Design a protein around this ligand. Sequence first.
Ligand SMILES: OC[C@H]1O[C@@H](O)[C@H](O)[C@@H](O[C@@H]2O[C@H]3CO[C@@H]([C@@H]2O)[C@@H]3O)[C@H]1O
Ligand SMILES: [Ca+2]
Ligand SMILES: [Ca+2]
Ligand SMILES: [Ca+2]
Length: 748
Amino acid sequence: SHMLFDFENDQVPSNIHFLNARASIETYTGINGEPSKGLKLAMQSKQHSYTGLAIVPEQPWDWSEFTSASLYFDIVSVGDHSTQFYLDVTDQNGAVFTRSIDIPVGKMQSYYAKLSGHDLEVPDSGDVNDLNLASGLRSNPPTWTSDDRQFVWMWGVKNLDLSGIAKISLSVQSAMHDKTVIIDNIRIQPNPPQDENFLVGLVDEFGQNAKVDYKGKIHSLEELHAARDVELAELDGKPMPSRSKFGGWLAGPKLKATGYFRTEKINGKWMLVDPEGYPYFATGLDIIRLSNSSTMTGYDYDQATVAQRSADDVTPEDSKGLMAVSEKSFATRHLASPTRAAMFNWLPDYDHPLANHYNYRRSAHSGPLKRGEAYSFYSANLERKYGETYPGSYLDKWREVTVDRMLNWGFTSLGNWTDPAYYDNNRIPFFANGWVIGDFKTVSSGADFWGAMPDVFDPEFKVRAMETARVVSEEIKNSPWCVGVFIDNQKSFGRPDSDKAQYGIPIHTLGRPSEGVPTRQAFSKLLKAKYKTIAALNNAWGLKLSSWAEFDLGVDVKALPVTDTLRADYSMLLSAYADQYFKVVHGAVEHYMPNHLYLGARFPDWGMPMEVVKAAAKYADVVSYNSYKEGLPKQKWAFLAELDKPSIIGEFHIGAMDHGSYHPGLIHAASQADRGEMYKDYMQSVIDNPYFVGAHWFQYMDSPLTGRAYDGENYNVGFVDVTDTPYQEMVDAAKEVNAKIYTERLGS
Ligand SMILES: OC[C@H]1O[C@@H](O)[C@H](O)[C@@H](O[C@@H]2O[C@H]3CO[C@@H]([C@@H]2O)[C@@H]3O)[C@H]1O
Ligand SMILES: [Ca+2]
Ligand SMILES: [Ca+2]
Ligand SMILES: [Ca+2]
């Protein structure tokens, strides 16, 4: 054991730094039962979107002797709210890792983050874009048993330079309430011996955490039917009152009815308006489909037996149907990864009734396999639950139960990425989506973790966009039940870290020649029109270029310091790029679906530069944002006033680890009950915000315990678990919320 901070000297140490937080020392009751001194941390996290502490020693700590060690903290929350801490650990080289956990109120516990050894020793597949551990899980189960709680892996470098640890930071970010905790006994402990079965036998035959019994866990087929039967008894298909046919408000004003979902401002607040003229507000869940419900098993087939992707396809591999596997494929089954295969206590044989829930993926964003067999436990359970009278009948059953669930829960919509077989449900509105993919030219932003950005000035981008919109139009059949269309998702436009980050598309593209790069030519044209002469450009940018043609050879603007004049041109360049994306996209959607709302490209918190946002404001009927935070702080969202566009949250969630999962997700609660409470706080901030016309939750079901095929997300982010059994705390929170969306929003 190596003690760093026990606070028994009664000082707030001068090498801890606090931001929008108050520190003091207090007596409290320690884990062991004795009164100890502790650091009480009162974060002003309601008023400020970033709060916490950072310990920064005089000199970086040298911990290089600790080749198998964890950093421990004792922590508890005080007051009314659980706390999600982010832990950021910085070495002397500017490498940092980020872990996170929930800190409940009540019982104090010990928390640990690995500095070295065990599942860090070989960390991933070698690939920079891999956030997962080498297991293909975003965060693994513990590598030893203890009552202590492992800080959950999020992102960053796994193996820091232990000779120089420069900063340890604990922060509360974008909270809706003030958070207060007590911290004690910050220390280093050598890791105990590694449990070499830690990745062995994780999953039981139902897809659940096999080594943990937890409240609500399924133990036999009979418990699965009894849970099914209690629910099928409660589901009648009656919506909350008094909804109109399209889930709009009966009891409000009645507006113009165009026969399509559209936008209008009511009482100073943006709303949707349903096809019959009633005020509408969108609530619901994303990923109402099976595509993301399979997990890599570790087996592969002969390539000759697997159908290849067509270059024409509008659907990227992550969003494809589950691939039915043929016998000829299955008969060539071989072990590509021992680590994956050993995780499962049960996979079926080819003749077994549940053998149709195998999948094959021909690519993956990340994880230790680039391709391979997968299995959908969720899908298997649908068949366990509902049987298969004719092939795939449990699918029709599921869809019909899903629609009943959504109406019972008071939701007004089926959210993004709803399977298209629900597009004629004709009982609840839905959101449609498409992706523009293909072999058009590309540009780099410096952080394209999911592929290079589109060259939107290349005519082949338009061709592909047109095709994308054609396929959506064919899917939705001009339906009034379609609220509107999302195109794409969190495109990597530019990050807000730095100028080099935000302006990466302009900067990188300026560096290339104009020849063969349509986006470069467009930038060239704009710059030519603003400046006309190479001298005027030379003066603006502080350059010595001999001509426009030298300039068109490509210019390295990386070392130039960003003056105001330079920033205006970066901005103007980013703006024209985004304008062109949104023009092409809007154009295609409008050509095919003249009547439907175009809903944007779903801006993540890490990819909404104001230039791109303002571009979306021009062309999209509704600006969509993804926002994985406790809620919508006023200060982070004040910019909306200047746009005055109706807006929508495409994604958000909160998860916990009390129901078998090893990763709560992006935002963490202390329990199933706390999740539901944290859901209400988020939604409340949506509801109070006069620019938002809806918010969707990501997603319907938990991701597979051993992580989704695509990228290893293994999150407790469902309204239902892998057995298709709903989280009642989530259900109840959604009923409370969905009960007041109209009355509160439009009310007195
Ligand atoms: O001028 C701002 C910079 O000052 C540098 O001296 C400092 O190293 C750098 O800090 C870092 O910021 C992010 C990029 O790499 C990591 C490092 O801690 C961090 O993730 C920056 O603050
Ligand atoms: Ca103490
Ligand atoms: Ca997937
Ligand atoms: Ca079957």
